[PDB]
Amino acid sequence: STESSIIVIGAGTWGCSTALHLARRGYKDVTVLDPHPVPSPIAAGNDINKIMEHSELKDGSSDPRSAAFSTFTRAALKAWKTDPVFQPYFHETGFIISGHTPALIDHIRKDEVEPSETNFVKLETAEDFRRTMPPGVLTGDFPGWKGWLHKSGAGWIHAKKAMISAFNEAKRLGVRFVTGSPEGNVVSLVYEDGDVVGARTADGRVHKAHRTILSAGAGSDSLLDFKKQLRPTAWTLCHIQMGPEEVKQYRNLPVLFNIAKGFFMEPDEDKHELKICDEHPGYCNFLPDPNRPGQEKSVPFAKHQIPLEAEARARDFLHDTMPHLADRPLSFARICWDADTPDRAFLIDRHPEHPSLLVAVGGSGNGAMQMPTIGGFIADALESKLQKEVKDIVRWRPETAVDRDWRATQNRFGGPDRIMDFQQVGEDQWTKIGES
Amino acid sequence: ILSTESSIIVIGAGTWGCSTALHLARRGYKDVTVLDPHPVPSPIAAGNDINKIMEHSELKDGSSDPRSAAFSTFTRAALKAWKTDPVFQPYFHETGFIISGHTPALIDHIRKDEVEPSETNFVKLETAEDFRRTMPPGVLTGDFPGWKGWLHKSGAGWIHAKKAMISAFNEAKRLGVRFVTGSPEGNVVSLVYEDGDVVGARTADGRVHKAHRTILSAGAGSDSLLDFKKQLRPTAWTLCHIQMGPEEVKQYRNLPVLFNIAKGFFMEPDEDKHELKICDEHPGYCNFLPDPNRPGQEKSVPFAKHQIPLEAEARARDFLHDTMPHLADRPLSFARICWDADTPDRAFLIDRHPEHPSLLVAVGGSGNGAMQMPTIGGFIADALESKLQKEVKDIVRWRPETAVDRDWRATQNRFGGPDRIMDFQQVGEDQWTKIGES
Numbered sequence: 001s002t003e004s005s006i007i008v009i010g011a012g013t014w015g016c017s018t019a020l021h022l023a024r025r026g027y028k029d030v031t032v033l034d035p036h037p038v039p040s041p042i043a044a045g046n047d048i049n050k051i052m053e054h055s056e057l058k059d060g061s062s063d064p065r066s067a068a069f070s071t072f073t074r075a076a077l078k079a080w081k082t083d084p085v086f087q088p089y090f091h092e093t094g095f096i097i098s099g100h101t102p103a104l105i106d107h108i109r110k111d112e113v114e115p116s117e118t119n120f121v122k123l124e125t126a127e128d129f130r131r132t133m134p135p136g137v138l139t140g141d142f143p144g145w146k147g148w149l150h151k152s153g154a155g156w157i158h159a160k161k162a163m164i165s166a167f168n169e170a171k172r173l174g175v176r177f178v179t180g181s182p183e184g185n186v187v188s189l190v191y192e193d194g195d196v197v198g199a200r201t202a203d204g205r206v207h208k209a210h211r212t213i214l215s216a217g218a219g220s221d222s223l224l225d226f227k228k229q230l231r232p233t234a235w236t237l238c239h240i241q242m243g244p245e246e247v248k249q250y251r252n253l254p255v256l257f258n259i260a261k262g263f264f265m266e267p268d269e270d271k272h273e274l275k276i277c278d279e280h281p282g283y284c285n286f287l288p289d290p291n292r293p294g295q296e297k298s299v300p301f302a303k304h305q306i307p308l309e310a311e312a313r314a315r316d317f318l319h320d321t322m323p324h325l326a327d328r329p330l331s332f333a334r335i336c337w338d339a340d341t342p343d344r345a346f347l348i349d350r351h352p353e354h355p356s357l358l359v360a361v362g363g364s365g366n367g368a369m370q371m372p373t374i375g376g377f378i379a380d381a382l383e384s385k386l387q388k389e390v391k392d393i394v395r396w397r398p399e400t401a402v403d404r405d406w407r408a409t410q411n412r413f414g415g416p417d418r419i420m421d422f423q424q425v426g427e428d429q430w431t432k433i434g435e436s
Numbered sequence: 437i438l439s440t441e442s443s444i445i446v447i448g449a450g451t452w453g454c455s456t457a458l459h460l461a462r463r464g465y466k467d468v469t470v471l472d473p474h475p476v477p478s479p480i481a482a483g484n485d486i487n488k489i490m491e492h493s494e495l496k497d498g499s500s501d502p503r504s505a506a507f508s509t510f511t512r513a514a515l516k517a518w519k520t521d522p523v524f525q526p527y528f529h530e531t532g533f534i535i536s537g538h539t540p541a542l543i544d545h546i547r548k549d550e551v552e553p554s555e556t557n558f559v560k561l562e563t564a565e566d567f568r569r570t571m572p573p574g575v576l577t578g579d580f581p582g583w584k585g586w587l588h589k590s591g592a593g594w595i596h597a598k599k600a601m602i603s604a605f606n607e608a609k610r611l612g613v614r615f616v617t618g619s620p621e622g623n624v625v626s627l628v629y630e631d632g633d634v635v636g637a638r639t640a641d642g643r644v645h646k647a648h649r650t651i652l653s654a655g656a657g658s659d660s661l662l663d664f665k666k667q668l669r670p671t672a673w674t675l676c677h678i679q680m681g682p683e684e685v686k687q688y689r690n691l692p693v694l695f696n697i698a699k700g701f702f703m704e705p706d707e708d709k710h711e712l713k714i715c716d717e718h719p720g721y722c723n724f725l726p727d728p729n730r731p732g733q734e735k736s737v738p739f740a741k742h743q744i745p746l747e748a749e750a751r752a753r754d755f756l757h758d759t760m761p762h763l764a765d766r767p768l769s770f771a772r773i774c775w776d777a778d779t780p781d782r783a784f785l786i787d788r789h790p791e792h793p794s795l796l797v798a799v800g801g802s803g804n805g806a807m808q809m810p811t812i813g814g815f816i817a818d819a820l821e822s823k824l825q826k827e828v829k830d831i832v833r834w835r836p837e838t839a840v841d842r843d844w845r846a847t848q849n850r851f852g853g854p855d856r857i858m859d860f861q862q863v864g865e866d867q868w869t870k871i872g873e874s
């Protein structure tokens with residue numbers, strides 16, 4: 001009931017959304033635990049921008065997984081446009097998806113464009129690309145590039161400020177946040193008679209609840225045996241600081257994304273920094289799995305640098321698109337952790353062996369744009385009224401992860417077109433921003 | 437009569453006056469005085485500009501006339517000196533020069549007048565992409581609609597005309613030339629005559645400055661100190677600056693001059709203030725007032741202003757829309773009008789006066805005088821010494837017969853804007869830029 005005690009582990013993208021939605025449904029006793037103050041330095045959703053896109057599928061070209069995803073993004077788009085908690089942070093500037101070989105371009109055509117009801121604008125030449133943004137922004141030769149522009153129902157979101165907005169509103173509606181170490185740093189789930197009855201934090205305190213929701217992003221994989229359903233995987237981002245005049249052209253830009261090179265989004269309003277992500281299948285940090293002798297398990301760590309090879313990939317993206325920026329010094333960089341499920345659908349379900357536990361994990365590279373509404377679906381799952389087509393897709397499904405190949409590229413491209421391992425990156429082979 | 441012990445007065449401490457003072461000093465003239473109403477660099481000198489275009493072209497045989505052959509002689513000498521003379525060399529940037537137009541007629545005029553006669557090997561620019569690739573990414577962003585052009589890669593570029601003039605002034609001073617600059621003390625109001633010859637100059641303070649020879653090199657202002665018999669038309673063009681930001685400016689380096697003969701040109705941002713200069717091209721403004729000595733006739737009279745007509749700003753922004761549209765709406769940081777004087781054939785006028793042999797005139801820059809800075813004082817000193825070389829001397833001679841019944845509104849091979857000579861007297865008081873006004 002709305003009087004039952006609930007604990008949410010993780011005050012990131014999905015945890016803050018969940019807290020807000022539970023408060024909105026009249027839940028009176030909700031406590032959220034995080035080792036860090038919002039926004040957490042290790043939250044994937046702690047980012048000056050993320051991509052938001054919604055596409056409806058053609059009737060004749062639907063499958064269950066993509067139909068479920070469309071249901072998530074349909075709700076998200078409506079909320080980004082109408083919910084005052086989120087509306088200020090959605091910039092509906094459009095979204096370009098592109099590649100630079102015939103194989104990549106065909107893949108996009110077949111998987112993204114043809115199944116979709118969206119009316120795309122086709123971009124055939126370098127001039128087509130450059131004309132999508134104001135003069136002086138795109139200056140590159142886009143060698144071999146073709147792609148498609150989705151003009152509306154897409155853009156970017158200020159994920160960090162949207163998360164803070166949700167946090168603030170959830171507090172206003174009476175949600176208690178314990179965010180800080182050691183008091184919010186959960187070190188174990190607490191079991192009694194085969195069920196989860198709450199969480200233990202690093203201060204020794206045991207927090208008891210009628211329901212416990214595990215929404216701690218990539219860090220969740222350390223708190224529960226997910227039976228290989230989660231792969232903690234990292235991607236890489238860097239910023240360039242734009243100057244006070246030049247930055248004024250760089251406004252209201254569609255997202256530009258080449259699925260095997262990277263993407264950038266327009267400079268932020270606060271620091272005037274332009275973010276580039278270099279696209280690749282991801283880094284893992286493969287260490288011995290303590291519970292599975294002879295096996296490996298990807299284990300997150302935090303770092304505000306990126307591998308030199310990642311910087312180089314970013315500068316190659318800039319060469320193609322904005323070569324006037326390709327030699328600019330980085331003002332900031334970091335690695336950023338999410339977790340992939342085996343099919344890269346979300347994992348939102350009550351645990352079959354521990355029914356008081358709900359897991360809400362597996363953003364799989366697509367969780368941030370869900371922020372406004374994901375907590376509603378998670379609350380639905382808590383209340384056993386998650387609609388069936390979504391439910392069946394995001395169910396607990398360890399049978400799909402038996403003998404998982406951690407080095408599967410899972411429909412990502414770029415760089416060496418394989419999963420990379422941070423254990424193979426030399427200590428001296430990182431960016432050194434702010435070091436000298 | 438003439439020797440290096442002889443007193444010389446130079447009227448006008450501008451582009452040509454400072455060059456002349458330097459050359460006289462180098463040649464060992466010991467008693468040289470230069471007069472100007474203003475301290476160097478004068479605010480009304482056409483040479484007082486953060487950049488000007490320098491270009492030299494060798495002509496094919498058959499494709500020159502004596503006038504263009506003379507001009508080539510001037511610019512050949514100038515180029516060699518811009519690349520070598522320690523006083524001038526630091527201020528020449530050999531970045532190249534693009535000449536272009538945006539109609540078939542304009543493009544054909546350039547082909548036949550500039551390209552075909554020239555020994556230069558040009559790079560042809562056919563497309564917008566061709567143009568944009570002449571400069572670093574982020575600089576040229578426009579569509580260049582209808583443009584075609586030719587790029588001249590070497591033997592051309594831009595000069596820091598203001599700093600080069602200051603350099604020449606400093607070195608003339610160091611070598612012992614005396615500069616009287618300021619008003620009234622250096623503001624010459626008349627030449628002084630005795631026995632039908634010129635014996636010096638009278639300044640606004642009533643003082644008479646006497647010398648054995650007098651050189652009149654006062655630019656457009658020369659026209660009010662001597663009866664040039666209509667050989668000079670004082671004519672003004674327009675420039676404005678945009679202030680570039682500290683990051684964006686770093687791409688705008690080592691740029692060839694871009695010039696559309698019916699729209700304008702720009703040159704790269706200056707090192708000190710990061711200001712990007714645009715000139716809108718047109719046949720010129722005159723300021724037509726009654727000729728005090730020719731009843732019923734008009735005479736163009738210069739005045740100074742650090743604004744430009746709003747119509748000129750608009751033409752400059754039109755040029756930017758075609759080429760660098762990301763800049764086309766930027767506020768101006770500075771603008772002014774800038775005066776030169778055209779002769780009837782836009783060759784220079786450098787000669788002893790046939791009725792007053794102690795007077796040498798060195799005038800008529802005709803839109804092409806600034807690039808001559810390093811060497812023009814040598815030619816002027818040659819004329820003073822009656823040894824101006826044969827390749828130029830008859831082209832730049834005193835020639836009032838060419839100016840009889842001169843049509844002041846002839847466009848004299850310029851294009852752009854309304855394609856006619858414009859009149860400041862028809863520009864409304866409220867129709868100027870208002871930079872720096874509350």
Ligand SMILES: Cc1cc2nc3c(=O)[nH]c(=O)nc-3n(C[C@H](O)[C@H](O)[C@H](O)COP(=O)(O)OP(=O)(O)OC[C@H]3O[C@@H](n4cnc5c(N)ncnc54)[C@H](O)[C@@H]3O)c2cc1C
Pocket residue numbers: 009010011012013014015033034035036040041042043044045046049050051052184185186187215216217218219220223234235236237277336337338360361362363364365366367368369370
């Ligand atoms: C580089 C990069 C680019 C991306 N681009 C996009 C995109 O453009 N669009 C998009 O939709 N998605 C994007 N994603 C994916 C998106 O960021 C994630 O799917 C989403 O943010 C995950 O949300 P989350 O709440 O599960 O995890 P997070 O937002 O990471 O939140 C997890 C929280 O759990 C906390 N936590 C950790 N350990 C514990 C503990 N022991 N106890 C309590 N709390 C704990 C952390 O401090 C953190 O606050 C991207 C991800 C990355 C890395």
Ligand SMILES: Cc1cc2nc3c(=O)[nH]c(=O)nc-3n(C[C@H](O)[C@H](O)[C@H](O)COP(=O)(O)OP(=O)(O)OC[C@H]3O[C@@H](n4cnc5c(N)ncnc54)[C@H](O)[C@@H]3O)c2cc1C
Pocket residue numbers: 447448449450451452453471472473474478480481482483484487488489490622623624625653654655656657658672673674675715774775776798799800801802803804805806807808
């Ligand atoms: C906007 C514009 C752009 C141009 N672009 C180019 C270019 O790209 N390349 C190029 O080669 N040329 C160019 N020119 C032409 C060039 O500037 C002139 O031909 C040259 O500067 C003329 O030099 P000058 O010494 O005759 O006159 P100025 O440099 O004007 O000097 C005349 C001097 O005489 C002084 N004076 C005036 N009245 C008196 C008086 N009563 N007594 C004493 N002194 C007096 C003034 O104070 C001034 O210092 C341009 C001109 C303008 C207006």
